[PDB]
């Protein structure tokens, strides 16, 4: 589960999300194993979407801003305008 959280794939539809929670579902803790399992807790592992909090938007905005250094002019690098 450790590995699944340190892994990151972007720019495509991935099941990386699904797995993370199927190793974490309490059913998987106990031997509640059979071949219907994936069907059973179907809800628990394929939740319905939602444009989650501003909580997000905020960070995503601050993160985006921090990953474009602006521009550094050869003219005066130290320029505080960057």
């Amino acid at each position: 589960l450790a590995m699944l959280a340190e892994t990151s794939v972007g720019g495509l539809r991935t099941n990386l999300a699904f797995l993370r929670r199927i190793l974490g579902h309490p059913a998987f803790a106990a031997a509640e194993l059979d071949t219907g399992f994936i069907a059973r807790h179907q809800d628990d592992l394929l939740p319905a979407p939602q444009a989650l909090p501003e909580h997000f938007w905020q960070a995503a905005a601050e993160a985006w801003l921090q990953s474009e250094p602006g521009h550094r002019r050869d003219d005066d690098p130290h320029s505080p305008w960057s």
Binding site: D75, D76, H78
Partner: protein, 537 residues
């Protein structure tokens, strides 16, 4: 260089410090909140009736045009404060410098919300003050045109004269000739006057179904040989992009129009011509916040300037010239965010040796091409009978010559008092410093409140004395009352920034970072060699 350090003598925990720092911070909060009121433009009222037409607001247009998170130095925000009868928010024109495609640019846009965006006398003054900073520092211009016309009732102070409207066009065609791009973004009405801002411009952009550039709008045009035509048909967006050629780019809306704009600044092949031996930036050694408490609250209470110096320079390293001589004026070399600078800061009165000290400094500075930084807190020149017989007159002159002629970049900031001859000998407004700023605590005037009421009333009883009478404490006191209050009123920052005597009131603990922004910006223009006039020895 562990010798060029300024070890502080201020205790940040003292009670006296907390006292000053107190009423200082209040002052700043005072400004803070006003500046917010001014952000409202013509008030939620029509400001919302703006967005109505699907038009982006002024300051919004600016943030969209700027570079992702670029800083923005705003100019004379307190413009026209309590000046005109009505409220004319930042004089109905917001201007400032900001990064646009990696270029420090001068931006000006009108607040359509403020009394129809028309030009009141000061709107014009602010506009022109911007083109100055622009020509003086070679910053390409971006005019976000959205104005009515010129404020019809006060035209006498808005149309004729030299530095009146129309001098906007003058500076413009001259800037395009001295090779400083002139970009125009039309996002509203633009009848008559401002009709030239986009007509006279290297590159021009129009927002369809919204932009309108015509000499005489339908009101005027109907008032002509009759004829009744609509805005869109007379001089709309489609008329000047597809027909006449007064515009160059056909933008679909405010957001598009600015995007088009960015692009122009992008194909500028622009390169900075300034040139200094800037060194790596190293922060000061004392929180620049601590300034709040270094500055006494008791206006005419003695403090050591080097303290303010130590909280702005790099690594608070400062090498002092003529260390112990006419100490009334402190002079030294240091660096600020890399950029090396030569400083001249008042520390009291100003005897003869202080100006010879300062004039001699300005020669060394102007000889190495290092920017000049003036920190005013001058009450005046020491007067007296021996003092006058000593040339405190001609030596003072020596200083001003040096200042008036210095051609390297000059920067002034008022942190105390601009009073009398002092203001001039320290690069006051009239000596064209690239930028002039004012602290909340500083006050400016020809001479003290009662000082002027002193003389002004003295003569009244000198002319009435050799006229066989005398001034009774009843009339004399009524002579000084009106003065003592007038002076107190026009000595205040708001009154000053309101009339553009300075490019704005700033946060004392932000100074350091304003100077860096400025200095860098002024390096878009070559540091020219200096030629001094005759020195009265």
């Amino acid at each position: 260089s562990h010798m060029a350090i300024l070890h502080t003598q201020i205790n940040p925990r003292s009670a006296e410090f907390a006292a000053n720092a107190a009423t200082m911070l209040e002052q700043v909060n005072a400004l803070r909140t006003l500046l917010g009121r001014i952000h409202e433009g013509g008030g939620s009222a029509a400001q919302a009736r703006h967005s109505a037409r699907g038009k982006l607001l002024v300051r919004e247009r600016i943030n969209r045009l700027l570079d992702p998170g670029s800083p923005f130095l705003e100019l004379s925000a307190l413009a026209a404060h309590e000046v005109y009868g009505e409220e004319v928010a930042a004089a109905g024109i917001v201007a400032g410098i900001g990064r646009v495609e990696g270029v420090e640019c001068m931006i000006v846009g009108n607040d359509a919300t403020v009394k129809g965006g028309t030009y009141y006398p000061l709107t014009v003054k602010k506009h022109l003050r911007a083109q100055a900073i622009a020509l003086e520092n070679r910053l390409p211009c971006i005019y976000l045109v959205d104005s009515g016309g010129a404020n019809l009732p006060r035209q006498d102070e808005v149309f004729p004269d030299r530095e009146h409207f129309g001098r906007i066009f003058f500076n413009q065609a001259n800037m395009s000739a001295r090779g400083i791009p002139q970009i125009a973004v039309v996002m509203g009405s633009c009848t008559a006057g401002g009709a030239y801002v986009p007509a006279m411009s290297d590159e021009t952009v129009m927002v369809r179904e919204q932009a309108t550039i015509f000499l005489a709008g339908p009101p005027l045009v109907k008032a002509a040989t009759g004829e009744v035509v609509s805005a869109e048909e007379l001089g709309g967006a489609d008329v000047h992009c597809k027909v006449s050629g007064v515009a160059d780019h056909y933008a679909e809306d405010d957001d598009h129009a600015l995007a088009i704009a960015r692009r122009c600044v992008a194909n500028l092949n622009w390169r900075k011509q300034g040139q200094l031996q800037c060194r790596a930036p190293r922060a000061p050694l004392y929180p620049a916040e601590e300034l709040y408490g270094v500055i006494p609250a008791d206006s005419k209470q003695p403090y050591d300037v080097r303290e303010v110096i130590a909280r702005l320079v790099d690594g608070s390293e400062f090498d002092e010239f003529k260390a112990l001589f006419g100490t009334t004026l402190v002079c030294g070399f240091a660096h600020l965010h890399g950029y090396p600078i030569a400083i001249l800061a008042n520390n009291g009165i100003l005897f003869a040796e202080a100006a010879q000290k300062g004039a001699h400094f300005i020669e060394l500075a102007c000889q190495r091409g290092i920017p000049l930084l003036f920190l005013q807190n001058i009450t005046g020149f020491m007067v007296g009978q021996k003092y006058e017989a000593g040339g405190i007159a001609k030596h003072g002159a020596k200083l001003v010559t040096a200042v008036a002629c210095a051609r390297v970049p000059k920067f002034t900031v008022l942190i105390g008092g601009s009073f009398g001859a002092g203001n001039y000998g320290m690069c006051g407004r009239a000596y064209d410093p690239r930028f002039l700023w004012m602290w909340p605590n500083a006050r400016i005037g020809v001479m003290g409140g009662e000082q002027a009421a002193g003389v002004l009333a003295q003569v009244k009883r000198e002319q009435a004395e050799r006229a066989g009478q005398q001034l009774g404490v009843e009339e004399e006191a009524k002579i000084k009352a009106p003065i003592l209050e007038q002076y107190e009123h026009q000595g205040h920052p708001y009154y000053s920034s309101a009339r553009l005597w300075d490019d704005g009131v700033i946060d004392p603990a932000q100074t350091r970072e304003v100077l860096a922004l400025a200095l860098s910006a002024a390096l878009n223009a070559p540091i020219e060699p200096t030629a001094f006039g005759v020195f009265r020895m």
